[PDB]
Design a protein around this ligand. Structure first.
Ligand code: 5ES
Ligand code: 5ES
Lengths: 232, 9, 229, 9
């Protein structure tokens, strides 16, 4: 394994270089539309993001060491969490708004519960002054942790070793930022506790997506549908 | 599975 | 504001002392309705003790009445579940709802297999990590204060920081290295994400059981359930 | 609602 022999800086360097781009939406301001249209736009976007997420996940240290079936499981469980943490990250310096795309910026006044929870998370990230290096670590943690309890033959032991490595990397980052040992542990705990809210938001969001599907007005792509059946 | 396909180049 | 003045040891003992007792189920070979009937009855009686436990969680008192209601409404099933998996540790492959209610995978109604398996997997995780009782009561209180804190507040984050300190203070003194300390901290907190997930899954089914109207819900459970919709 | 009463008693 290569991932188990990366130094903290090498870990960060790899994750940073593996970052997916920020895709645009169609939006069209001239279009006046709706709740249907907006969800239609977000569905299009998510579907194109998923292709980059898959190729990004391959560059996450340790992911390719897993079997093909294990890769499938981890992504099926975590895809919306990962999309959502990306969303709140790029929404940090846009208080009271969500930047789904550089041309798609939404405020509250137009699912409000999901909106408010996404806002609360982005605001939480801003107060903490979350760093890009810390963000990419958290995102990788989500990919590896969310499906590890839902899978002899054989490991997951390996997954935990890489998770521990990412933990090491996080702490290393906080050390270089001039934090005390007490501050390092406290910040670490704060970051991981937010992963619990992100799971909550993903769960609630999955419910709506399942409603949307059965009330066949907002069409899902073939890939998004397959990802939806996974959370049966 | 589309996801499985994409994961192998 | 008394919770912040407490030492680490003072924090531990206060939490251990606040622990709710272990209740019993009723004293037949189980069907779909009757099994959920027993758990429902059990859960209702446990809630009364959970509230008195909540009052004795350092810092929970300082909150307003409405903020107490919110945290409890968001976190009650999580708290029950982490309770369930904790006492199920010494019973691998089974779930000990009560000392006279030990269950295995063999049937559960339908779709209960996944929640059963998820709960069983958490218990095994606690087993291989060798989770201590001191660590457990810390996790449980963390769940109480965190799960509703994102409005779904500065004092709470200060208290959360305090409980973090206690955990690290427990791993140190257990002989763990600095590296082993923050590694174990991370491992423990990540399981909380899974516990949130199990709660969500379990909640939707209680909402479903309600619409089926075969297993009768108590008025208190109804209110706790309604708050998730 | 019930919860309030229990948190006061
Ligand atoms: O980068 C992305 C982040 C999130 C999302 C989604 C976020 C999402 C998911 C479910 C419900 C909601 N509700 C919602 C809608 C608009 C808001 F402003 C706030 C919440 C969002 C999403 C939307 C549709 C879809 O088919 C798949 C993913 C998409 C891309
Ligand atoms: O200490 C307790 C822990 C959990 C629970 C419950 C656990 C629960 C909740 C929803 C679904 C399931 N699924 C399930 C059923 C049977 C099994 F053997 C395993 C899982 C459990 C619960 C059951 C009914 C109720 O009205 C409130 C809480 C009760 C007490």
């Amino acid at each position: 394994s290569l991932a188990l022999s990366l130094t903290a800086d090498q870990m960060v360097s790899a994750l940073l270089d593996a970052e997916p781009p920020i895709l645009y939406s169609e939006y069209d301001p001239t279009r006046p539309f709706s709740e249907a249209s907006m969800m239609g736009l977000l569905t299009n976007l998510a579907d194109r993001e998923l292709v980059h997420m898959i190729n990004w996940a391959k560059r996450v240290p340790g992911f390719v060491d897993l079997t093909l079936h294990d890769q499938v499981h981890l992504l099926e469980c975590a895809w919306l969490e990962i999309l959502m943490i990306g969303l709140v990250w790029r929404s940090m310096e846009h208080p009271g708004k969500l930047l789904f795309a550089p041309n798609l910026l939404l405020d509250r006044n137009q699912m409000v519960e999901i909106f408010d929870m996404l806002l609360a998370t982005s605001s939480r990230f801003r107060m903490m002054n979350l760093q890009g290096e810390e963000f990419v670590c958290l995102k990788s943690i989500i990919l590896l942790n969310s499906g590890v309890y839902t899978f002899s033959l054989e490991e997951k032991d390996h997954i935990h070793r890489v998770l521990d490595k990412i933990t090491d990397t996080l702490i290393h980052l906080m050390a270089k930022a001039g934090l005390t040992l007490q501050q390092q542990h406290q910040r670490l705990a704060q970051l991981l506790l937010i992963l619990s809210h992100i799971r909550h938001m993903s769960n609630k969001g999955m419910e709506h997506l399942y409603s949307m599907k059965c009330k066949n007005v907002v069409p899902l792509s073939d890939l998004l549908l397959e990802m939806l059946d996974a959370h049966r | 599975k589309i996801l499985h396909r994409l994961l192998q180049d």
